[PDB]
């Protein structure tokens, strides 16, 4: 009897809550989480066993992100106020998030404070203190009661692990030098996966804030998804970002280890849903239990555009962010 | 009897030649000089006395700009090959251009090489050598034979002067420290304008790669257009950019010195046509001659969107850039 599990994913939102360009000071139809959330609802309606994750580069990039750090830094840091972007994610009932490089742009304290307000775990395994301790929650495992194809309950332990590029040491040198170090993405995965398996994880989802190259690279690579898929063992699904590209896409047809039709790399489903909420990532897993152990019998990775599928703003996003958005308009209009 | 002179302006194109997103690897209708050039053609058909200028942040920003610096650096530097973006500008018969902050991202030598290939002058008055000499052509004056409203010829000397924000010393510290310095925008204008008037300039156009604030600022300001308009004398038209905003726009109604209906600041027409070719700036001057000297009798600044006015790519742009664009696709796809 199988379990059909769906994972929905956003990446590189870059603080675009509304379908709005603060620079031209105009509405747009082309991007924004208020539009992507319409796809999220649609997919949730299709499968009760649905998880929702974000892949980082979330809280920074436009004037709304600037507004939050300028006007609410102290209260966000203390946990008094929830970061307004995190409030949206909370309203949407995200199950997990992770850190992109741009999460570090406003300093470590603001990031810690941002994380404090999330209802869901925000994980990262490769950023460490100067003495070698995990600087963030490295992974989490949640026991989920999923419904199988016979309608029966199946308890399945789902784990999330996250990765950021080591190049944050360059990009955010001022904020980070002397305060953290960053372990190679693949080496972090290999160190951490065994622990997740020991602690009972049945399905492991990588929130890999890192892109895709067509061939192997060595340690320290900025865009390491191919290496994650080939050099590790135990990851069942990979969410990709950072490059602001699309995966799957036709360009990868004929590249060793890639299956464009299935959206897989080395047999593991991978999705990279563009940037700014222009696409939603969708991974389907068919889980099969044997010998008390779960495996992935079949999978697919796909992406869906908001273009042509979405024509209006999601009310949950709009209602949640509205005040902050109007505050941002005032801030921008000086 | 008057002369109607029209000035068309682009700004912050950021190497978007085609209406194409290299990151998602697909066509867009949203931006690109190939679309803006359709507005250029339309406006040129409306008035024989038309000038065309670019306001900087032109050669950098996307993978096409990267392709040029990576694959053609040596030949661009020597002047052996024209920068492909500059070939497009040459083909569209631009009359002048200027330096935005991003022109410095690839170093001083590459920028010098890029400029060598332009058929038109690229001016900048405020970047200086460490000893105080102008690092670039500070201004140019061209005697134009314009046609007045009686159909008669009128020789009018048009000058172009350009400015970049002094903050390039921070943004491009590695490329610039110890090699140039940057004079305050207003102070550069006040130093340079008298010389232009001495050399006979009748009409002076500022290619001001700098944005707009609603009230006065002091020396060293990043966004200095208000101060240019109020603290200098002798500028007849200002092209603004850098902020990626819109001007004229309704937000400025009721702000002292601003006239939204006419698109002026302190009586001088100003335009800021968004970014990436999403708008074309259009300034109309009605020039009158009294006693051997020209003055601007009436003026207007306006911007026009490619949205709703343009539905296809301009052939001169496409034909000129096609090979480079195809090479860029190969580069991006690896
Ligand atoms: Mg960063
Ligand atoms: Mg990133
Ligand atoms: Mg700029
Ligand atoms: Mn990003
Ligand atoms: Mn720009």
What would you note in describing this structure?
- Two copies of one chain form a homodimer.
- Chain A is α/β, with parallel strands linked by helices and 334 residues long.
- Chain A has one domain: Purple Acid Phosphatase, chain A, domain 2 (4-Layer Sandwich), CATH 3.60.21.
- Helix content of chain A is 28%, strand content 28%.
- Chain A is built from nine helices and 18 strands.
- In chain A, the strands form five sheets. In chain A, strands 8, 9, 11, 12, 13, 14, 15 and 16 form an eight-stranded mixed β-sheet that branches. In chain A, strands 4-1-17-18 form a four-stranded mixed β-sheet, covered by helices on one side.
- In chain A, helix 2 crosses helix 4, helix 2 (63-78) crosses helix 9 (315-333) and helix 3 runs antiparallel to helix 9 (315-333).
- Chain A starts with a strand and ends with a helix.
- At the A-B interface, loops of A face loops of B.
- The structure holds magnesium ion (MG) (3 copies) and manganese (II) ion (MN) (2 copies).
- One magnesium ion is lined by residues 57, 100-102, 209, 242 of chain B.
- Chains A, B: It is found in: Secreted, Cell wall.
- Chains A, B: It comes from Bacillus subtilis (strain 168).
- Chains A, B: A divalent metal cation 2 binds at residues 57, 101, 209, 242.
- Chains A, B: Belongs to the 5'-nucleotidase family.
């Amino acid at each position: 009897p199988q379990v059909h599990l769906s994972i929905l994913a956003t990446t590189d939102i870059h603080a675009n809550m509304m379908d709005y360009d603060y620079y031209s000071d105009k509405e747009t139809a082309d991007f924004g989480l208020a539009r992507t959330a319409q796809l999220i609802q649609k997919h949730r309606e299709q499968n009760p066993n649905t998880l929702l994750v974000d892949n980082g580069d979330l809280i920074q990039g436009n004037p709304l992100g600037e507004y939050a750090v300028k006007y609410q830094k102290d209260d966000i840091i203390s946990g008094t106020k929830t970061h307004p972007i995190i409030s949206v994610m909370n309203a949407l009932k995200y199950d997990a998030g992770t850190l992109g490089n741009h999460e570090f742009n406003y300093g470590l304290d603001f990031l810690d404070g941002t994380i404090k307000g999330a209802d869901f775990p925000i994980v990262n395994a490769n950023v460490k203190t100067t003495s070698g301790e995990n600087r963030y929650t490295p992974y989490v495992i949640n026991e989920k009661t999923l419904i199988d194809e016979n309608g029966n309950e199946q308890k399945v332990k789902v784990g999330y692990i996250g990765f950021v590029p080591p190049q944050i040491m360059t990009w955010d040198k001022k904020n980070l030098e002397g305060q953290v170090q960053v372990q190679d993405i693949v080496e972090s995965a290999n160190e951490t996966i065994p622990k997740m398996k020991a602690e009972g994880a049945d399905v492991i989802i990588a929130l890999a804030h890192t892109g895709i190259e067509k061939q192997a690279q060595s340690s320290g690579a900025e865009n390491a998804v191919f290496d994650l898929a080939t050099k590790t063992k135990g990851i069942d699904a990979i969410i990709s970002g950072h490059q602001h590209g699309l995966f799957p896409s036709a360009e990868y047809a004929g590249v060793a280890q890639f299956n464009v039709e299935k959206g897989t790399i080395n047999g593991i489903p991978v999705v990279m849903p563009s940037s700014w909420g222009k696409y939603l990532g969708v991974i389907d897993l068919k889980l099969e239990k044997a010998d008390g152990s779960w495996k992935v019998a079949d999978s697919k990775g796909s992406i869906e555009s908001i273009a042509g599928n979405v024509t209006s703003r999601n009310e949950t996003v709009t209602n949640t962010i509205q005040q902050t958005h109007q505050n941002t308009l005032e801030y921008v209009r000086k």
